[model samples]
Target: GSSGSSGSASKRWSPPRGIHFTVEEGDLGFTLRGNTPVQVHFLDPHCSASLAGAKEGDYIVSIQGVDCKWLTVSEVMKLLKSFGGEEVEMKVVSLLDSTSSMHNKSGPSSG
Candidate 1:
């Protein structure tokens, strides 16, 4: 003979809806969803270029400042977001020396 005990008493309680979670403070990058438009600005030492791209009902995750190992995309995004959407300044040093090419290409006739 065994004592009668309800098995529900030992069952763990669970919420009906799943928990909602957002990215961490240092989580950078943005997901483009559903034909979203994106503006890109490429800045070099001397010259800068601005371009734009659009996603046709697709998601594209972009992480900037990650090409170089010096800084992670998350870290850079955190710093920028911290400033209340203000402009952020950064100093970068490239291993490759392109001084000659930059100077030579300064003039259109040089090319």
Candidate 2:
């Protein structure tokens, strides 16, 4: 007897927890890389966005509650333009845990 293809587990992809933050004013101050998975890059350290905890390499999961993970650059801009709020809310998925900012080395090295 062999196992059949009955009641198999769902194939839905599970994304990491979203880190929520608000941009009180001004621009997002970060550039987005990639298409489907828009990645945050070259964020201005002097901008409030940096203070809001958005880091480089983080994925823009949503913007103003609109899904951005699967959006193109133009589409993403549309969402950004559609929102005319004093403050914008965003949720991002970090490549590494926020706590991974340790030491600057990828891993422990035995000298």
Candidate 3:
């Protein structure tokens, strides 16, 4: 025999997997290690960030076009809220666990 939706045992929620994601209205997510390397710690199940393509342990390089450099976690949160609050574009790079398999960054671009 099996229980119905009321039991809550059949439900399994998992975060989406990808490198780039966009925040959407009513979507909620959170982060940690908020400086230089702001890491994505949690993403809501129905959240756009989770559904679109944000992953845990990725370093947030930019938020709403503001650099993650020299910004505190609190400031980032505030900036996000102050600037439209939703549907904001954010960029994140997956952490290379080691140097051998790493695909890393760049220098100043002329464009």
Candidate 2, pairs of clashing residues: none
* Tens digits of lDDT, candidate 3, 14-90: 32223444443244566566575566667466655666666667566677677864666777666556654455667
What does candidate 2's lDDT look like per residue over 1-110, in tens digits? 77457787654333544444444335767666678667767557875546766667766778877888889777876676566343667676755323545465476779
Compare the candidates by lDDT and give the number of the best one.
2
Best by TM-score: 2
lDDT of 2: 0.64
State, as a TM-score between 0 and 1, how close model 2 is to the true structure: 0.56
lDDT of 3: 0.58
TM-score of each: 0.23, 0.56, 0.54
Ranking by TM-score: 2, 3, 1
Candidate 2: misplaced stretches above 4 Å?
1-27, 96-111
Model-by-model lDDT, in order? Answer: 0.28, 0.64, 0.58
Predictions: Cα RMSD each: 22.4, 9.1, 17.2
Indicate the residue-level lDDT of 55 in model 1: 17
Q: Please report how far candidate 3 places residue 57 from its true position, in Å.
A: 1.1
